[PDB]
Design goal:
This is part of a larger assembly, with nine protein chains of nine kinds. By secondary structure, chain G is an alpha+beta fold. Chain G contains six helices and ten strands. Chain G has a single domain (11-237), classed as Glutamine Phosphoribosylpyrophosphate, subunit 1, domain 1. Helices cover 36% and strands 24% of the residues of chain G. In chain G, a hairpin with a 5-residue loop joins strand 6 and strand 7 (155-158). In chain G, helix 4 (167-177) runs antiparallel to helix 5 (184-198). The longest helix of chain G has 22 residues, at 79-100. The termini of chain G are far apart. Chain H is α+β, with helices and mostly antiparallel strands. In chain H, the strands form two sheets. Chain H has a five-stranded antiparallel β-sheet. The termini of chain H are far apart. The chains are: A alpha+beta, B alpha+beta, C alpha+beta, D alpha+beta, E alpha+beta, F alpha+beta, G alpha+beta, H alpha+beta, I alpha+beta. The G-H interface holds G 1-2, 4-6, 8, 19, 22-29, 50, 52-56, 59-60, 62, 78-81, 83-84, 124-128, 130 and H 4-18, 38, 108, 112, 115-116, 118-119, 122-126, 143, 146-147, 153-155, 157-162, 172, 175-176, 179. Strand 11 of chain H pairs parallel with strand 12 of chain I. Chain F: One of its GO terms (cellular component) is proteasome complex.
Chain lengths: 204, 243, 244, 194, 231, 196, 239, 250, 220
């Protein structure tokens, strides 16, 4: 009945010391049935990462939309879209269909190439900018992630310490959500490099 | 091909001839008018020529009450003048409805001047051969005179005159403002401002006036109104009384 | 002035719209129609030229009623006048539907003026080849108006158009001079017939039929009605008697 | 309603039931629930009575129109991306296409088989083996146990026999066997002794 | 002259040449005569054929049991106007159960014909029509012109050489207007009138066409052998 | 609510309470339910607040546009404009209106436009939820051509009982007196009318 | 309004489209643009027509545009008209990626714009686009491709082409020196040598030059040269 | 009655020139002179205000207008076209960019939208080109201070310093001598006034001259406090008093 | 949500809490609920967070364009008219309940707009789940001729009542003070009565606690 709960999945973003982390589970399913263990939900449009949870068809549609929009933005602007600007691009795009909305919760994460400060922002299915300085959660297990992230997270974590915190928050929240799991991917986003890591987790 | 003189497109000199000819259409009624600003009122004086004995002088008017506060005196053919008046009345009412407050005189001049520009760019639409002089006492700017022309140009005025003898009237106003060294007629009541405006219309045109030769509109706070023939007669009597 | 007169929306170097001026030449070729404003109403009269005996008398009515209190008489291109009056009937009905009151004559005159004027704006349309004398009685008295192909209109004490306009206007001026206190509706009907007969002296080559109409507060209770029967014949007799 | 697909080392094997049921009785027991989109791309479909064939034939026309226009065969990835877009457009249209498709093809430029599962919502996912509806409830446990990427076409067919036998044993409905087609480097062929 | 190129141009003298040219198309058509008494209205039409191997093109059209018309000029325009007239007569019956008055029917054509004489893109209808009908006001006869002018007449003629027939009707006006309750005597009067418009030919069984409508007579057209007795 | 309009000798008086409720909660207890659609034409609004406010805004725009073109409208014209909006959208706009106005020729006029969208000219009109409790009182006590003082006393007694018995009516009593002398606004607080 | 219509979309008595011929004449007065396809890349070079010491060469990108991560175009003729077509080309390239999830083939993109140009040439009554394009791009099918299209809507594939002013002289010079087996670095020289000879000014300088290349991580890169980079190669090439 | 000018009134002549564009550019040449100078820390756009009559209140007619808080424009040519064109530019700055990206467009993109509007009039049916050339000065965080000229044809170019209108040839020659890559904004205003002083024929004072600058953000013009990320408009009109003060030191 | 507006002797002050909830979960603990329509016209929205943000952003755009068109400081009435007409056009589907307050050349104004397009004038207003709790404080303590300090205290005290007594309201108090003669001052996080206490233990994992399958470097 609820489109956002058909396919499951979860995305979490955390901020550290001049670094951002965004992680997601790799499960795609049809309610109880798990279909794919390689359905990545985090997409990047330069140095800005977008994690979209919710209906898998809308996640795919919005990826091609924001790739279409960010590709045209860089041709006209001759520069990559910054996380703050992209956050409003996502917000407006989701609101443009207030009455035909996508059943998706996106999570923007990135580092402003000019100011260099970490940025993460959250959204509803119709585009309410939930800009947070600490962490953002989305998906079926948002309840689990909120309590899990709210306890483990502490300000100014180093990139190595941020990976342990976000990965542990994701794995333990995913373990308590039926529709989330089948592996997870963690991006550690720094001003100079990005590291992508696949986590070992329960396959049930 | 001589298209450039028949539709609003540029000629080799960069001129829109059809717009230039629309200016000639404004003087075809041979009616002179002037507008002056008092301390708290704006007065429009316009000649009223009714050579035909069968006409009803009550209906021969070139001053239009666009809104409660905005008035307009048009120079040019009456059919075009009434076209602009109806559009101005519609614009002012729509502005009040959309934005919740009475349309300022300057905004209406801008809105009506933007329409005149469209006729000057679209080849489908011809320019209106009228010059619109909006007068009011704005809630913020006070007394206001804004004159729009067929080219889409408009600007505020301290005092303005229009018609074949516009140059003659303007020099008289220019000299008066030069000597007084002020931007408005320094009178506290509109009856004295009306008498002032009529006096220079008489002096500038060098012609005696009767109550039937003038049509007068007065813009005050929260009201614009046109004086009747009997009300104009009282002003003429005062002028003949030298006070 | 040639070159600038082949299109409808074009200003000539003098600012004159020649096509509208040529539309006026169509009016001046039409049969003379007049309108007299009496102290409580209006009276309309039109000369109907009898092209041949085969025209059935009294059927080719040329005065038109709009709603129930406005009467329209015009000269020039008769089809254009019917087109204009058809619009007035639509404008009058629309006003009554929205505001529930019969359209005031000054309000009606503006509705027609905007329509006639709109036909001088674009070169894809032609100006009206009619001058329409129209008027009636409304909440605040009687009104008489006269449109021109340019869309110009004014209120008139007495209006005349058509070929005999110059002749008729002379007697209309005499009426206002002789009767500044206001002419009565019944006397206006008699005077209207006399003026049309005198104006017909410009069209002596052909016979004509006089058609009169009028709208008075006292006599029609403010509604527009035609002159017929005894009252028409008294006007015809008076007009002939003055001619003779 | 059975639509199965298994990608093996050198080819893609698509199996689809032969039965057509309309209410009380089985109208046909030899239906082919597939359309050849390209010489090396095959599409199996399942869903509502009329939507499956109207959609499949509409997709086939566009892929054929592209091939004639550019004189070039779309890759299976591009075809699946095109097919997913139409399903995504329809799911939120006046009358959605309730069609679930499997797109198996051979990419002649990467020289690799490709299997794509797209449901009526427009959820495209590439799998080693796919199934639509409840047909995947009975078969995934076998495929998860026996599938290996390096199987030959003969081993893949042997694995489909096990998957079909399990469907016959436990699924209440009688789907009248399956038609099996293999998409290989040489094109599309049908296995008749299955 | 350059003022006759389109229907939205006045000439320096106020004339609409395109409308005048449409009126000239009627003068090329064959003569058709219309006349009426107080009880009956009659249309007499001379029909013309391209060649003596050709049939005579029909001139009378039926719009109701109580209304019909003859045409002169562009026959295709007559079909457009006659179809429109049928719709208006049709509309009156369906919505009001009221037979469309002939006068009102004429004004509806006047309004439609005028539209083509004032806006660019269209052309005037190059056809003149004689509309006869019987309603609760008696018999009627209307002459319609491309300019939109519609006149109600005792009798008239349109088409080539129509002046001869029209002149005859004027002299005979005092006579045929009194032919009440005698349908066949009106037709004789009309046939005698149209016979004044014949230049180098005589009326024949196939050439002539007649129609009549009256108090009890529904609109009937007499062609071929039916008009054998009136010739 | 409880809205009321009473014609009297010198003109017409519009009156209403000030309470608007969303269920049991009084969202605003000092609301002004008397709306000016023209200089001497005022209306009372009952029913949906959004619909009545939208209609009043549109009617004011129409009468403003009417005045610039056709002179000052009459109260009948204002009610006619209300009818078109209320009737042509009767399936959507749940609005019941009382229109009262003054003009020199007709003196005071009152038009009630109930939920259906019909228009009725009345000597006095009462509407709103609280009006049902004063149908008997107003009928027994209303008189033609009362003075301003008698009408105000009559209205105060009428609304005090409508306020007394209706939960969804209360607050201050706001009156607008339309006469040749101009528009006059009066307000009566509970301490003034509650112990009548 | 019929009298003021110029009848844009009509044939001449000898079967030519007048406005398309006049549009081409307009392009012949624009700055020269050269495209050379090498074995390992494509070179797009253009000559700025408007030039002054007060003009900002650093950011005045007016003839070389990027349509995609793999395609670029050099423009000759009305700059305003081109940017209208440039944006539709960019949108179409992204629409193709959105639909097929692959980069648009160069020919498909060229065909779409040429269809847009042809449309104005056959219906609608509007004047043709007065712009000629040189498309340089890469795709998996044909590799490096160089196309040109003109207001008529006709497009052709080329190994080396020039559009704009002095095309006859530029083409003749390219015929003399173009070798099929040449590298991009040789194409860098040939493009500059050809422009330096057909340029209408006294000498060719970095301020007058727009310059870009497409070349092969094993992935095709697009480099639109910055003014200092152009100044460097002009010295290296010896101009 | 319908619009029947669906055809283009601007067409190629046999010589390749578009007649209407060339005539539109002529109207700019007889236009009043306007110029802009790009400094290291700002842009100055200036023009003189020739009054239709001494009774006209020239303060009510601003030839320099704000498009976005950081972008301003001045024109030469036909005044009415600039007014409607500015109205379009302000609208498109919101509908096309701000309402999507949440921030005002950079100068380059806003100039592109303005150029698209002018180009549309150069090819769409039943319209003439805008008879105005705009000098659009702006600032953005990534491209810095920039100055663009937009022509009736829709072509736009970036300029270090430029002048358009009646005295453009003389002004541009003067600007070439004076302009250098080390100018500060206070020096550009001095150069702008000197260049404008040559062009003006009548009175040269703060009332007959109109200047605007893009420079440091003006938090005092922001209108509110409490959001540090909001720093205020960079576009500022110099009032007649400010100009008159600089004229005394000219 | 708790939102209040309090008109005082020389202006108007609007305050709001900063908690945003998705059902029973607190999605954002420091959401900014006071939105600008123009420099001196501000809006506070309850109900759906997206519509309130989006509706004000659309009207704020039109106010700026209209201000540039008319060369005048925006009227609070213009915002109210365009805001209510927009909401009415959508027949209440845009669930934005708004308190719009500001100062314009005609004085200080305070209106509330409901999702269906109805508006009311008031000297003190409240919206959100905490409206009844906040209105209890406003009714008890509001008085004519409040000074700027009394109004800010009253507005904050009213918001606190909603914070403490309403589950849907909490965290911090946002205050914006708009006075007729001077600029609007946005006091973000005016009061922060709900600062979290120190945790009992530190949950810093030792590096290497997480099991990893593969590691990669992503190109930008």
């Amino acid at each position: 009945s609820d489109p956002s709960s058909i396919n499951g999945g979860i995305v979490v973003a955390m901020t550290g010391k001049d670094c951002v982390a965004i992680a997601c589970d790799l499960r795609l399913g049809s309610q109880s049935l798990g279909v794919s263990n390689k359905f990545e939900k985090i997409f990047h449009y330069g140095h800005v990462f977008l994690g979209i949870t919710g209906l898998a068809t809308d996640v795919t549609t919005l990826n091609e939309m924001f790739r279409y929009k960010t590709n045209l933005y860089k041709l006209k602007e001759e520069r990559a879209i910054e996380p703050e600007t992209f956050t409003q691009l996502v917000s407006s795009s989701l609101y443009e269909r207030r009455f035909g909305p996508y059943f998706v919760g996106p999570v923007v994460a990135g580092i402003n190439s000019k100011s260099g400060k970490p940025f993460i922002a959250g959204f509803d299915l119709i585009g309410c900018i939930d800009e947070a300085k600490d962490f953002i959660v989305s998906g079926t297990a948002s309840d689990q992630l909120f309590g899990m992230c709210e306890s483990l997270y502490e300000p100014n974590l180093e990139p190595e310490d941020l990976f342990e915190t976000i990965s542990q928050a994701l794995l333990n929240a995913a373990d308590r959500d039926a529709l989330s799991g089948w592996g997870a991917v963690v991006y550690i986003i720094k001003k100079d490099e990005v590291v992508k890591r696949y986590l070992k987790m329960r396959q049930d | 091909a001589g298209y450039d003189r028949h539709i609003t497109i540029f000629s080799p000199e960069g001129r829109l001839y059809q717009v230039e000819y629309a200016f000639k259409a404004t003087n075809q009624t041979n009616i002179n008018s002037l507008a002056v600003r008092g301390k708290d009122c704006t007065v429009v004086i316009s000649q009223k020529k009714v050579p035909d004995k069968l006409l009803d002088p009550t209906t021969v008017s070139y001053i239009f009450c666009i809104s409660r506060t905005i008035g307009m005196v048009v120079n040019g053919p009456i059919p075009d003048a009434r076209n602009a008046a109806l559009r101005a009345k519609a614009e002012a009412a729509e502005f009040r409805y959309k934005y919740g407050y009475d349309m300022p005189c300057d905004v209406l001049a801008k809105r009506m001047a933007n329409l005149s520009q469209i006729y000057t760019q679209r080849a489908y639409m011809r320019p209106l051969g009228v010059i619109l002089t909006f007068v009011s006492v704005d809630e913020e700017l006070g007394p206001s005179i804004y004159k729009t022309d067929p080219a889409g140009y408009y600007v505020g005025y301290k005092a303005t005159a229009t018609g074949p003898k516009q140059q003659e009237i303007t020099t008289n106003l220019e000299n008066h403002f030069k000597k007084s060294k002020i931007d408005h007629i320094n009178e506290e009541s509109w009856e004295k401002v009306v008498e002032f405006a009529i006096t220079h219309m008489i002096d500038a045109l060098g012609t005696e006036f009767s109550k039937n030769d003038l049509e007068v509109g007065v813009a005050t706070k929260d009201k614009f109104f046109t004086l009747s023939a009997e009300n104009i007669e009282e002003r003429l009597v005062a002028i003949a009384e030298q006070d | 002035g040639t070159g600038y007169d082949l299109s409808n929306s074009v200003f000539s170097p003098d600012g004159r719209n020649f096509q509208v001026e040529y539309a006026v030449k169509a009016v001046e070729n039409g049969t003379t129609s007049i309108g007299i404003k009496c102290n409580d109403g209006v009276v309309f009269a039109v000369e109907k030229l009898i092209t041949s005996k085969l025209l059935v008398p009294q059927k080719n009515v040329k005065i038109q009623v709009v709603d129930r209190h406005i009467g329209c008489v015009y000269s020039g291109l008769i089809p254009d006048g019917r087109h204009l009056v058809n619009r007035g009937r639509e404008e009058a009905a629309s006003f009554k539907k929205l505001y529930k009151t019969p359209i005031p004559i000054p309000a009606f005159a503006d509705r027609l003026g905007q329509y006639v004027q709109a036909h001088t704006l674009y070169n894809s349309v032609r100006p009206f080849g009619v001058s329409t004398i129209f008027g009636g009685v409304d909440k605040n008295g009687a009104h008489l108006y006269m449109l021109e192909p340019s869309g110009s209109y004014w209120g008139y004490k007495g209006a005349a158009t058509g070929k005999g306009r110059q002749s008729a206007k002379a007697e209309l001026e005499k009426l206002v001079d002789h009767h500044p206190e206001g002419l009565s509706a019944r006397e206006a009907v008699k005077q209207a017939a006399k003026i049309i007969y005198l104006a017909h002296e410009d069209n002596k080559e052909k016979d004509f039929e006089l058609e009169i109409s009028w709208c008075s507060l006292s006599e029609t209770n403010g509604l527009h009605k035609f002159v017929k029967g005894d009252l028409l014949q008294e006007a015809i007799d008076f007009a002939q008697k003055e001619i003779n | 309603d059975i639509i199965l697909g298994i990608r093996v080392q050198d080819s893609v094997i698509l199996a689809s039931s032969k039965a057509v049921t309309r209410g009380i009785s089985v109208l046909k027991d030899s239906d082919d629930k597939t359309r050849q989109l390209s010489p090396h791309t095959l599409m199996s479909f399942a869903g509502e009575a009329g939507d499956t064939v109207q959609f499949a034939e509409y997709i086939q026309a566009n892929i054929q129109l592209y091939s004639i226009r550019e004189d070039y065969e779309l890759s299976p990835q591009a075809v699946s991306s095109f097919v997913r877009q139409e399903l995504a457009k329809s799911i939120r249209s006046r009358r959605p296409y309730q069609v679930n498709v499997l797109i198996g093809g051979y990419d002649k430029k990467k020289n690799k088989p490709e299997l794509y599962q797209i449901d009526y919502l427009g959820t495209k996912v590439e799998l080693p083996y796919g199934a639509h509806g409840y047909s995947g409830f009975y078969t995934f446990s076998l495929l998860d146990h026996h599938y290996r990427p390096d199987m030959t076409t003969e081993e893949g067919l042997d694995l489909l026999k096990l998957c079909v036998q399990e469907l016959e044993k436990r699924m209440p409905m009688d789907f009248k066997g399956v038609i099996v087609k293999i998409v290989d480097k040489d094109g599309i062929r049908q296995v008749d002794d299955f | 002259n350059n003022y006759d190129g389109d229907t939205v141009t006045f000439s320096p003298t106020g004339r609409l040449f395109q409308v005048e040219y449409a009126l000239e198309a009627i003068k090329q058509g064959s003569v058709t005569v219309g006349l009426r008494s107080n009880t009956h209205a009659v249309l007499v039409a001379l029909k013309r054929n391209a060649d003596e191997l050709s049939s005579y093109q029909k001139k009378i059209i039926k719009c109701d049991e109580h209304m019909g018309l003859s045409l002169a000029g562009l026959a295709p325009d007559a079909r457009v106007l006659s179809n429109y007239l049928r719709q208006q007569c049709n509309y009156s019956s369906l919505v009001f159960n009221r037979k469309l008055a002939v006068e009102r029917a004429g004004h509806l054509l006047c309004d439609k014909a005028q539209k083509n004489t004032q806006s660019y893109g269209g052309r005037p209808y190059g056809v003149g029509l004689l509309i006869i009908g019987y309603d609760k006001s008696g018999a009627h006869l209307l002459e319609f012109q491309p300019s939109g002018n519609v006149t109600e007449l005792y009798g008239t003629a349109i088409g080539a050489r129509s002046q001869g027939a029209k002149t005859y009707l004027e002299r005979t006006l005092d006579t045929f207007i009194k032919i009440d309750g005698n349908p066949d005597e009106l037709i004789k009067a009309g046939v005698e009138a149209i016979s004044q418009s014949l230049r180098d030919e005589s009326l024949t069984v196939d050439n002539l066409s007649i129609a009549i409508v009256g108090k009890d007579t529904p609109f009937t057209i007499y062609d071929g052998e039916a008009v054998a007795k009136y010739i | 609510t409880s809205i009321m309009a009473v014609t009297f000798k010198d003109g017409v008086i519009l009156d209403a309470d000030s309470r608007t409720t969303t269920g049991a909660y009084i969202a605003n207890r000092v609301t002004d339910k008397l709306t000016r659609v023209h200089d001497k034409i005022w209306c009372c609004r009952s029913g949906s607040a959004a619909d009545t406010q939208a209609i009043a805004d549109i009617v004011q725009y129409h009468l403003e546009l009417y005045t610039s073109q056709y002179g000052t409208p009459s109260t009948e014209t204002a009610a006619s404009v209300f009818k078109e909006l209320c009737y042509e959208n009767k399936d959507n706009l749940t609005a019941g209106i009382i229109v009262a106005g003054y003009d020199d020729k007709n003196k005071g006029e009152v038009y009630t436009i109930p939920l259906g969208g019909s228009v009725h000219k009345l000597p006095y009109a009462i509407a709103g939820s609280g009006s049902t409790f004063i149908y008997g009182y107003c009928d027994k006590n209303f008189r033609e051509n009362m003075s301003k003082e008698e009408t105000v006393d009559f209205i105060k007694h009428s609304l005090s009982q409508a306020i007394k018995w209706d939960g969804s009516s209360g607050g201050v009593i706001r009156m607008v007196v339309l006469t040749a002398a101009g528009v006059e606004r009066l307000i009566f607080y509970p301490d003034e009318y509650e112990q009548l | 309004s019929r009298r003021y219509d110029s009848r844009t979309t009509i044939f001449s008595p000898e079967g030519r489209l007048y406005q398309v011929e006049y549009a081409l004449e307009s392009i012949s007065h624009a700055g020269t643009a050269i495209g050379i396809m090498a074995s390992d890349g494509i070179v797009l070079a253009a000559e700025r027509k408007v030039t002054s010491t007060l003009l900002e060469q650093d950011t005045s990108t007016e003839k070389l545009y990027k349509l995609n991560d793999k395609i670029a175009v050099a423009v000759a003729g009305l700059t305003a008209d081109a940017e209208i077509l440039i944006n539709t080309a960019r949108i179409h390239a992204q629409n193709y990626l959105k639909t097929y999830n692959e980069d648009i083939p160069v020919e498909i993109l060229v065909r779409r714009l040429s269809d847009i140009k042809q449309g104005y040439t056959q219906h609608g009554g509007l004047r043709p686009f007065g712009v000629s394009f040189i498309y340089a791009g890469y795709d998996d099918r044909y590799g490096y491709q160089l196309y040109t299209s003109n207001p008529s809507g006709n497009y052709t594939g080329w190994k080396a082409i020039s559009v704009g002013a002095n095309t006859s002289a530029a083409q003749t010079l390219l015929q003399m020196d173009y070798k099929d087996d040449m590298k991009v670095d040789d194409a860098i020289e040939l493009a500059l040598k050809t422009l330096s000879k057909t340029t209408d000014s006294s000498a060719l300088t970095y301020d007058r030059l727009e310059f870009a290349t497409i070349r092969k991580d094993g992935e095709v890169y697009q480099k639109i040269f910055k003014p200092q980079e152009i100044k460097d190669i002009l010295v290296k090439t010896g101009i | 009655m319908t619009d029947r000018y669906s055809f283009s009134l601007t067409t190629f002549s046999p010589s390749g020139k578009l007649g209407q564009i060339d005539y539109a550019l002529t109207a700019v040449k007889q236009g009043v002179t306007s110029l802009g100078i790009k400094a290291t820390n700002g842009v100055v756009i200036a023009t003189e205000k020739k009054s239709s009559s001494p009774l006209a209140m020239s303060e009510t007619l601003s030839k320099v207008s704000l498009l976005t808080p950081d972008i301003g424009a001045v024109y030469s040519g036909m005044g009415p076209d600039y007014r409607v064109l500015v109205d379009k530019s302000r609208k498109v700055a919101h509908t096309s960019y701000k309402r999507i990206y949440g921030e005002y467009p950079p100068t380059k993109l806003l100039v592109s939208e303005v150029a698209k509007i002018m180009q549309e009039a150069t090819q769409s049916g039943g319209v003439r080109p805008f008879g105005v050339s705009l000098l659009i000065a702006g600032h953005d965080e990534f491209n810095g201070f920039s100055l663009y000229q937009v022509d009736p044809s829709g072509s736009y170019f970036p300029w270090k310093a430029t002048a358009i209108g009646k005295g453009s040839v003389a002004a541009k020659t003067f600007l070439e001598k004076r302009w250098n890559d080390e100018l500060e904004l206070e020096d550009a205003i001095h150069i702008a006034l000197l260049t404008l002083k040559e062009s003006v024929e009548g009175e040269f004072n703060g009332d007959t001259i109109e200047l605007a600058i893009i420079g440091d953000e003006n938090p005092d013009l922001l209108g509110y406090t409490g959001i540090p990320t909001d720093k205020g408009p960079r576009f500022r009109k110099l009032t007649s008093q400010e100009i008159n003060d600089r004229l005394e030191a000219l | 949500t708790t939102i209040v507006g309090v008109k005082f002797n020389n202006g108007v002050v609007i305050a709001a809490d900063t908690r945003s909830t998705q059902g029973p979960i607190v999605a954002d603990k420091n959401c900014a609920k006071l939105h600008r329509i123009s420099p001196k016209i501000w809006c506070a929205g309850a109900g759906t967070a997206a519509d309130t943000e989006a509706v004000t952003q659309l009207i704020g755009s039109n106010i700026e364009l209209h201000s540039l068109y008319t060369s005048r400081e925006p009227r609070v009435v213009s915002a109210l008219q365009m805001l209510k007409q927009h909401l009415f056009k959508y027949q209440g589907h845009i669930g934005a309940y708004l308190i719009v307050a500001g100062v314009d050349p005609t004085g200080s104004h305070l209106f509330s707009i409901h999702a269906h397009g109805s508006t009311d004038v008031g000297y003190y207003l409240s919206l959100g789940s905490g409206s009844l709790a906040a209105m209890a404080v406003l009714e008890s303590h509001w008085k004519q001729d409040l000074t700027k300090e009394e109004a800010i205290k009253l507005a904050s005290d009213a918001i606190q009542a909603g914070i403490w007594n309403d589950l849907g309201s909490g965290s911090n108090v946002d205050v914006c003070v708009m006075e007729i003669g001077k600029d609007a001052e946005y006091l973000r996080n005016y009061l922060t009565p709900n600062v979290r206490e120190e945790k009992q233990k530190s949950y810093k994992f030792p590096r290497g606690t997480t099991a990893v399958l593969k590691e990669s470097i992503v190109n930008i």
